Amino acid sequence: MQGVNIYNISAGTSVDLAAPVTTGDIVTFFSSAANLNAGAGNPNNTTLNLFAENGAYLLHIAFRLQENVIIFNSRQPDGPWLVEQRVSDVANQFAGIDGKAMVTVFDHGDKYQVVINEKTVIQYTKQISGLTSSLSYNATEETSIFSTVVEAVTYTGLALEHHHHHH
Amino acid sequence: MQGVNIYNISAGTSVDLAAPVTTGDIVTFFSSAANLNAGAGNPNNTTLNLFAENGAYLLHIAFRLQENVIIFNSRQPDGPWLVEQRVSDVANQFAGIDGKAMVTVFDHGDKYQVVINEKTVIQYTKQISGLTSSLSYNATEETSIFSTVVEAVTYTGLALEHHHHH
DSSP, X not given: OOXXXXXXXXXXXXXXEEEEEOTTOEEEEEESOOOTTOOOOSSOSEEEEEEOTTSOEEEEEEEETTTTEEEEEEEOTTSOOOOOEEEEOHHHHTXXXXXXXXEEEEEOSSEEEEEETTEEEEXXXXXXXXXXXXXXXXXXXXXXXXXXXXXXXXXXXXXXXXXXXXX | OOXXXXXXXXXXXXXXXXXXXXXXXXXXXXXXXXXXXXXXXXXXXXXXXXXXXXXXXXXXXXXXXXXXEEEEEEEOTTSOOOSOEEEEOHHHHHTTOOSOEEEEEEEOSSEEEEEETTEEEEEEEOSSOSOEEXXXXXXXXXXXXXXXXXXXXXXXSOOEEEEEEO
């Protein structure tokens, strides 16, 4: 059935989900800060990640202020990064809301829809499929664009289809 | 198309949704406070409402500390409250999380599923159906169990239609 799970992810840590995220499900990362003028990334200021059971990066979201771009990518645990998708201008994606921020990922089965606050920034066609079993928020205490602790809320068991048959 | 909408609702006000909440959709109210010792309501400490286009109260959630209960009901704007549903032990529902809280409502079509933080408090069978076009959060400054401003986040356009051709 439908359920809500809340996790508090501190910068540089990861967490296993009590209920996995699958097709039709949603996860939102809430930040109590929006530091768009933070220190220099190395090159990442912040990364948000959805991992499969084997450690594969189902979705890697990297926020780079200096390069001024958000990178979306995937890869297997022992493999090379795959084909990256870029969204230029980090500040612009968060425009409208300051002092806080939220990033939402919808798992649509074939694609991951990422929304920054109320703006959909990409319809990321998946490069690797499967259930998300863990999440992570990685950054340093001096250059993250988000608060020290990011609250992740997952809405699972959602899948609702309406079958129409034609012959 | 699926989308996320964010609304800051001050106590004692309502907001019209940019995208309606229908079957399969979600709405969550976030509070930066959890004042479970705010005193007696008048009679409500806090209420959260989902309104239909015509003003009907599709779902009315009322928290009463002095009664140690959470009430769920519906009504037409010019009509009386209908059959009241109650859930006792307000504290137990918010147990586990302090200093903040979140209330999630799932629209299942024939029922509204309400979740406080991670706990499902009630599977409310609807007494009035339809789409939710607006929301409201009412309370006084000194006795609300939530923060002066509540942030409502809606996830809409979630249900999908699957066509099969044979």
